[PDB]
Design a protein around this ligand. Structure first.
Ligand SMILES: COc1ccc(S(=O)(=O)N(CCO)c2ccccc2CN(C)C/C=C/c2ccc(Cl)cc2)cc1
Ligand SMILES: COc1ccc(S(=O)(=O)N(CCO)c2ccccc2CN(C)C/C=C/c2ccc(Cl)cc2)cc1
Ligand SMILES: COc1ccc(S(=O)(=O)N(CCO)c2ccccc2CN(C)C/C=C\c2ccc(Cl)cc2)cc1
Ligand SMILES: [Ca+2]
Ligand SMILES: [Ca+2]
Ligand SMILES: [Ca+2]
Ligand SMILES: [Ca+2]
Length: 144
């Protein structure tokens, strides 16, 4: 790990952990998933948590959250899950995620960000330098 990978991962954790109590619950997981256009059942939420629930307390703490990261880094999400994620961001469907589109998704996740901060995330993911994120750039981002 790097210092900035840890900081990246802690912020990712704090968006699932809505009440900042240190554990992600099925209710918090369900709330995030609905804000990203998904609709898991209560049992699917339990299945997701149980796949990385090391100590069997039914919630996900930061270490378990990291281990999930390293897992989907080894075996990536399926193509269709990555395609679905892209569609969540690319709301006009034109093939490119803009800063405005990234901003709209962050507002649904309850993430406060300046405009420059949104622009920074776009620039980091952009490869060809057109200032937008196409599917290929998105796939590369999501697969480590
Ligand atoms: C920058 O803004 C964002 C917004 C959302 C995420 S996203 O991580 O929700 N995402 C990653 C795609 O794979 C995602 C993106 C779009 C649509 C749906 C998802 C959820 N996917 C299935 C994985 C959810 C499985 C899962 C299980 C348990 C836990 Cl604890 C956490 C996640 C990331 C960054
Ligand atoms: C390869 O292309 C990429 C890869 C990673 C990201 S990055 O936005 O994660 N990033 C991690 C540095 O800290 C980052 C990178 C460059 C500039 C700004 C950031 C955002 N950071 C400061 C706060 C992180 C807020 C945040 C929210 C939601 C989630 Cl799910 C995760 C993190 C962007 C594009
Ligand atoms: C399967 O379980 C999960 C759970 C959580 C996630 S995760 O996606 O939240 N995640 C953690 C965050 O660090 C992540 C993991 C691996 C690779 C990339 C990310 C998110 N990257 C930092 C870019 C996020 C910023 C960004 C910028 C530019 C654009 Cl255009 C869109 C988004 C994924 C899968
Ligand atoms: Ca919590
Ligand atoms: Ca646990
Ligand atoms: Ca678009
Ligand atoms: Ca681009």
């Amino acid at each position: 790990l790097t210092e900035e990978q840890i900081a990246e991962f802690k912020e990712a954790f704090s968006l699932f952990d809505k009440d900042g109590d240190g554990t992600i619950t099925t209710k918090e997981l369900g709330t995030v998933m609905r804000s990203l256009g998904q609709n898991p059942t209560e049992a699917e939420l339990q299945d997701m948590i149980n796949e990385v629930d090391a100590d069997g307390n039914g919630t996900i703490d930061f270490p378990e959250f990291l281990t999930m990261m390293a897992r989907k880094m080894k075996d990536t999400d399926s193509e269709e899950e990555i395609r679905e994620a892209f569609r969540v961001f690319d709301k006009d469907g034109n093939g490119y995620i803009s800063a405005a589109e990234l901003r709209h998704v962050m507002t649904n996740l309850g993430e406060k960000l300046t405009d420059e901060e949104v622009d920074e995330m776009i620039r980091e993911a952009d490869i060809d330098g057109d200032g937008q994120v196409n599917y290929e750039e998105f796939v590369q981002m999501m697969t480590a």
